[PDB]
Amino acid sequence: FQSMKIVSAEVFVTCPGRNFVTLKITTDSGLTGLGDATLNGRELPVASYLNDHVCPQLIGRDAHQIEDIWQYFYKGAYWRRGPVTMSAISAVDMALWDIKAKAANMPLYQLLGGASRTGVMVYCHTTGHSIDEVLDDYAKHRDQGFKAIRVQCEPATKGSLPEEQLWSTEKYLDFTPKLFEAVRDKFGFNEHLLHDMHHRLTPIEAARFGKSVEDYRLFWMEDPTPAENQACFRLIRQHTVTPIAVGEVFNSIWDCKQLIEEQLIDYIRTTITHAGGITGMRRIADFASLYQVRTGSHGPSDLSPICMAAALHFDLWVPNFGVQEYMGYSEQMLEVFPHSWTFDNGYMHPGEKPGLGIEFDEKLAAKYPYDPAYLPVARLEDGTLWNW
Amino acid sequence: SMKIVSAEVFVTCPGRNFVTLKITTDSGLTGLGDATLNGRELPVASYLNDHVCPQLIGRDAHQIEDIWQYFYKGAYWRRGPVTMSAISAVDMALWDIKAKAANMPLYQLLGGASRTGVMVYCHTTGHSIDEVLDDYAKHRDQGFKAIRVQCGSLPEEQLWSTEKYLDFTPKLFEAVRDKFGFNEHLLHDMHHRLTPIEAARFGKSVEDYRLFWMEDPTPAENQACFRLIRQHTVTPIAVGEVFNSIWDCKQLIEEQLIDYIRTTITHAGGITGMRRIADFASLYQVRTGSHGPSDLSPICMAAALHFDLWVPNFGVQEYMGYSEQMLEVFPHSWTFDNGYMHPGEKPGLGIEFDEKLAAKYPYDPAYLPVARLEDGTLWNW
Amino acid sequence: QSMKIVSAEVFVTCPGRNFVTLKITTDSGLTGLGDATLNGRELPVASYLNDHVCPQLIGRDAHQIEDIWQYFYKGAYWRRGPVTMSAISAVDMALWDIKAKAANMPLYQLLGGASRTGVMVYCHTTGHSIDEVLDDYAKHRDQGFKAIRVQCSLPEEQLWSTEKYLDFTPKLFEAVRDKFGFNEHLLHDMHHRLTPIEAARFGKSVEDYRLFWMEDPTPAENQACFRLIRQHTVTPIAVGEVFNSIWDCKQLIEEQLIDYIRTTITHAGGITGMRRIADFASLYQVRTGSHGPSDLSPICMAAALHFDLWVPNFGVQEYMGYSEQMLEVFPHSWTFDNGYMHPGEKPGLGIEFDEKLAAKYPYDPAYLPVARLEDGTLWNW
Amino acid sequence: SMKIVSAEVFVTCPGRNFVTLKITTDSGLTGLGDATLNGRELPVASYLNDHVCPQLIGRDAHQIEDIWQYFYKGAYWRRGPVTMSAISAVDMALWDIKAKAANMPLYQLLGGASRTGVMVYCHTTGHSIDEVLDDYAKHRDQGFKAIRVQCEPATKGSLPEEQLWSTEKYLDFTPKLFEAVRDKFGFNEHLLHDMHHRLTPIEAARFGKSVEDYRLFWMEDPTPAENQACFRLIRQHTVTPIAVGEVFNSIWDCKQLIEEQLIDYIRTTITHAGGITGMRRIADFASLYQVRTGSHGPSDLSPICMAAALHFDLWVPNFGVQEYMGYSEQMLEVFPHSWTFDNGYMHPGEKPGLGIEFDEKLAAKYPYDPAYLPVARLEDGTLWNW
Amino acid sequence: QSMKIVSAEVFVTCPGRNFVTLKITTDSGLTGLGDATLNGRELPVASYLNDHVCPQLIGRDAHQIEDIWQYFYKGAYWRRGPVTMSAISAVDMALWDIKAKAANMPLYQLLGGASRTGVMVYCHTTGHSIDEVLDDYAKHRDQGFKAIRVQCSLPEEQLWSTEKYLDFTPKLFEAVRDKFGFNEHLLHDMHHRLTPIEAARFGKSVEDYRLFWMEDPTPAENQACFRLIRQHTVTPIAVGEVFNSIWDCKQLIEEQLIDYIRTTITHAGGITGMRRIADFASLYQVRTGSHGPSDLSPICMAAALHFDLWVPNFGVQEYMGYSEQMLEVFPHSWTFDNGYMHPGEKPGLGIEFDEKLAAKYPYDPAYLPVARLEDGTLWNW
Ligand SMILES: [Cl-]
Ligand SMILES: [Cl-]
Ligand SMILES: [Cl-]
Ligand SMILES: [Mg+2]
Ligand SMILES: [Mg+2]
Ligand SMILES: [Mg+2]
Ligand SMILES: [Mg+2]
Ligand SMILES: [Mg+2]
């Protein structure tokens, strides 16, 4: 309210179905803020970054100074950005905005400039090992009122060893376009059809693929090629009108500045938890808007419901909103995070609970100890370690 | 939630012309915004009164973003000085309301303080070197850490000569540094008078005196015109007081042709727009240098100080200042001490408007001067 | 030899919709008219003229068109924008009216004389179904139109959906070309609704039907946004009704991203500004296709037809048409024969303004619609 | 095919914190790797201990490249300081092992010696011109051919020290310093200077112009480089050479700086920028543009990194210089070394592998002790770059 | 610890065609071989080694591979080129042979170890008609080949016609994909015959058949000549068999104009040079596809397979094959199983050179063909 100094900043590691890492900031006034810090397959280094280094440095600080605190840790780290660093910084930022919206006694989205929309369009996944199988999952999710659907013919598998998947580009190219003809043939052009390419193709391959699918008018093709070299998207963009989305693996505006300003992409999928929190995400979204690039935040189960809360708040205000991904959470996971958001015929809403409108049931959570789970790696026929 | 019950515009001339917007919610909350456009005040009065204000009535005062977008895109004819002065008034006033509603000084809503105080600069007047040196001492004595050094119904017409300016103006700075050393930041306004290669020369000619910035070197409708300056001098460059949009300066920033962006709350889209401008500028290590003359109302000054306190890439804040007469009309809460200002801690912007004191000053026309060269050529003032 | 301006007055009338007219009178009794209409923001321009520009016009030599344009363009300090430029254009238009009268010539003669024998215009087509559009198309063809554009209180809010537009609209053109063949020019307005890669797709999807142009594909404040469209389709692009300046379109043109520039006399700086725009466009083989809706007054249409008859790189002229009522307030002298118009041979613009009929209809507030997406996102209308 | 049986992480603080990785093959071959990330050590210990090390067990230690790729790409979340510090530890450790297997000092495996020694530079300091001049004198006497002039930064404690910064004062004073140094000692030694990320580009442009007469070997870290285009303004206004990259973890951090020829020295390191595998690719790329290596070498990189760097330095064609801030003897006891120093030049030695040891028993006498780099703030409290 | 070179000898033999081999021997008796073969210009390389490089190798520490490479690369003063680089590559190859032996490892181990389990190779197809090609294709498939390349005294002169090639060749691929489906990788060599817009057309004309690559579309001395191809087709491009340096392909790669770089150990600077080429290529997602004809000696193929097994960005390896006769002179240790090869686990390159069998076949002059167009214009073969 007046000057809320931080009395404690605590890290919680729990596995209610999968691993989540959580930060809790408490002020002297007793206000609490929650932040997700989950980094899938590499959760603990982030727990450490916070527990051992950042949290002790939060104590005594005026929680009102979100920006100074962000700068302090972003630059003060000396070694800048990266996934572990930014997961930490984001967790803090998220928690501080929670607190601030509470101090203000409003739902966060009000603080960002209010609602730009009445609801947040979300999209879901279809899983099947044949055309017929997918066609059904689609039918199913349609009926549940989803207006956007991701077609593909828990990723982080328990077991301290990453599972190794064989991959062939040639086959994927020849078949996948068939997958979409089918979905359009059967269901018409009524829902938004999304597709994730999982970083598997070289640029000229991703170019051919995009062309190969223009007839089916995808809402987007995602993560066409590894994007560490942002110029690699140029070849795709000059050869196809299939929209491009990328960015779930990005942790900073520096990862995507060139992709945006060269207009190489249509949707930016950076997330509150990995790309610098509310503070970072606002800057990314606003930058994107200059180039008519829209938001399409990554939303799998490996970002905690805390992140989902913050994302929905962000999504209701942000002018250049595109879509919000909504893989699900098991009931088991949701129980650990009492929420207050709503889902209604394809659209979500963060609700009107002050702050993020989210909770963390520590006692429940403290009953699921951390349990090692890792994302798969991909190799080619010949063993070449590839992009998963 | 709060519906807008009334949106009223006030024109007053407490020593100079000011146009003010007052928004009132069904809950009692009021928000103030500046709409002052020097020399073209009344077209903004009309833009609000006759057009925007009526369409504000009944709306949720919480939907700042939707409202900005509604009037920015909804106008169909986009941006411009009159349009953006109107949109910014509204925006400034809704953030006053939002932060009152949240019971916080605005800067708290922007992300909190990044600094303890806001460095400001003032103007030193003179008709000779010795006069300027005097006003300079006078201002350093008042605690200023930054000092800017310069030697009716019808606009005054002023005669301009570039060649004389080029030949003389550098001796002025030499004088100032000779007497006062290099302790204060030395700023200078070029008032759009030079072509790019002239500005290049000027910049080079003042490199020894390490200026904080040279401002408004050449008109910037063609943003590429700053390329020649930038490739020839390491004298820092500031620009933007006349801009009303990110679109006015995106190329200047992204090509790194400027060091300070001088856009303001009242003319460049309010808190909402200025945030986006400043954040974009930061990617390129461009800092804020907001324009702050007497022809932007204390209401703008209130918001600017709130903004300046949070904004990470803050550079400096201009403070021309106000007469006591002007201020009386705008009861204010900001503080000043030893060359630094602070917005204060009052909820909202921390500013008020004396509607009946204002009522005593009807609008009195005044116009910026135009410049002409020797041969009469209409030039840049 | 010297035509001092004795008066410059602003009239606002609503003979079926709103119009703002400027009247300049010299000491010799010569009068010139200028349109100042800005749809849905009419009164701020009224003010810009009435309160600020007009009194500064008094005493001036109406012969100095260029000096006046520059005086108000730069003298304003806050440069360009829709309200500013509507005012400056009103003046410029009326000053050329006066100059052509003083020369005892129709204005096109002052511009360099006729480059064509008549000005090809185009019209719109009403229809809520492929079937109803095909009817209006047939009708307009019978009226001799050689070029046809196909489309299927408080601001009305309209629900927009890009995906539907993408899927349906190509069928409308297949229809029209199936029934009517490739005899007329098929124009189409996209109304700023698509993102750039969306517009790229659209343009590609309509290549078979060989459109005269697709217009306003995407908001163009970021002029580079047109690059993605232009590299993906050979469907010609037209833009610019919402522009007030060469600065709004210089990149679009110099990067050869557009085929037609649609800026108008009333909004883009008058005859003086339009000339510079057209000439610049021509270097890059961009042709004119000026915006001509009902919300630009018959004074503009007269100004436009003179401009159109002369300008070498002429492409086409829009003609939404006027109601018998509106036309009344503006006695006119142009002609229309078999798809082609002509300004006539009367001195000046060849246009009148019936002030007493005008004073019969008072200003009546009317505002353009806004667009929203399904989720309520404020969009481009 | 010598499989990995253990991959152990140690955290010791013999004067300051180090993190060390030890890999052991089934044949008993061991490899050491540095993983120290100053002020953020423990997330790297965890990245290894908790995630990477268990996934190394049973793999063939010969497959340096598959392993590099496996963790680089396999992480899904690519690069960054913690990630690359972990990956680098394992890489230089695998190269240690490979050179041992080859029964050769590592430089031989990289392509052999390109020079007879490795020119290093030391730090000079003082709070007055006169004092710096003194320290300079000393270092020339010790035989340093290159000297860094300015006028243990990570301070033990809970909270980062906060330092007041003024750019204006720095611009006006600092050239006088170099003048004095040149006036007194002539132009016989290479004169270096670190700018510590403090300046904006146009400011750095001016500074660089302002010191041209003193012909600096380089001016380092002029302005934050997250936006690499920020170096264009500097490079077009001054002929003072530019070094940067101690804070980089990847080729992606510097590829634009190098290919637009905005820098003369790349300062990436074995521990932070991807190990031997990563640094080779970085050095080779830079050579195309006539950019040379200027490896960062403070005390906060372990003597294991120094051993690897000297091996790398002896081979790499485009070698520029090697920083050698130095190690207290307490530090060195824990890492029994075999490199040599002789008149401003160093040499990795001829011991197989890296030629470096880690005395686990001694390391165990010194437990992790929190210490953090300072932050900078301006007069008004603005959080700046330190 | 120190391996002085005691001897470095050059052998020229024609066991079915010409080969030039270099043998380096150390004071410890370790020997390393290197290929120096340059097809049709074999003897100038023999000389470069024999007369100039080899005596300068004597007395030197064979451990200093990098210093030696640099000494001859820059020391030559006249830098790179086919003859120069064949010589430098011969040396480099043989020096790494020696180093891996001294390390008692197969060389791939020195490079960073295996990145794959085997090296995918591809083969050619003989046929004077669509029908005969389809047969050889079937054959090679049965041999387990996973990737197949389809083609239909004094230098022999060959008549070339681009227009015919353009019209026919797409049918060859339709055939192959009609009969055999999309199971194998279809490669194709264009042999430098087309201009860039011709190659653009060709690539487009074959998109349906999804080639693994089209190779050598146009002479590439002007690397920008590849831009027109790359903007017009998504058919992957391979190039580089004729390159001797990174300088020959740096632009092709950095502008992302190619998908495979085909430089070889023997011609492009040895292991040392190829490593730098591959690593550079990888930044841009360019993969290796090294040229492997009979005119590169089994020493090269052994060098290549080691390189291929390690290099992360491996794409494919050509294997024209060797005659039982040639293979004789070069006892080898690599394997080939089911479309994939492997260098083996022998220390060094794993290759021998039967000197006494070699001295049985003397040099026999053989020269590549030249191409001429109809009118006799000397063209690219
Ligand atoms: Cl990281
Ligand atoms: Cl305006
Ligand atoms: Cl040669
Ligand atoms: Mg994905
Ligand atoms: Mg100024
Ligand atoms: Mg239109
Ligand atoms: Mg440094
Ligand atoms: Mg070939």
UniProtKB/Swiss-Prot annotation, chains C, E:
Positions annotated to bind substrate: N39, H124, E241, R262, H291, D295, E318
Reaction catalysed by this enzyme: D-mannonate = 2-dehydro-3-deoxy-D-gluconate + H2O
Function recorded in the entry: Has low D-mannonate dehydratase activity (in vitro), suggesting that this is not a physiological substrate and that it has no significant role in D-mannonate degradation in vivo. Has no detectable activity with a panel of 70 other acid sugars (in vitro).
Taxonomic lineage from the root: Bacteria, Pseudomonadati, Pseudomonadota, Gammaproteobacteria, Enterobacterales
Descriptive protein name: D-galactonate dehydratase family member PC1_0802
Keywords of this entry: Lyase, Magnesium, Metal-binding
Catalytic residues (UniProt): H191 (proton donor/acceptor)
BP term (GO), one: amino acid catabolic process
EC numbers, comma separated: 4.2.1.-, 4.2.1.8
GO MF term set: magnesium ion binding; mannonate dehydratase activity
CC cofactor note: Binds 1 Mg(2+) ion per subunit.
Residues of the site described as Important for activity and substrate specificity: P293
NCBIfam families, sorted: ManoateDhtManD, PRK15072.1
Family: Belongs to the mandelate racemase/muconate lactonizing enzyme family. GalD subfamily.
Residues that coordinate or bind Mg(2+): D189, E215, E241
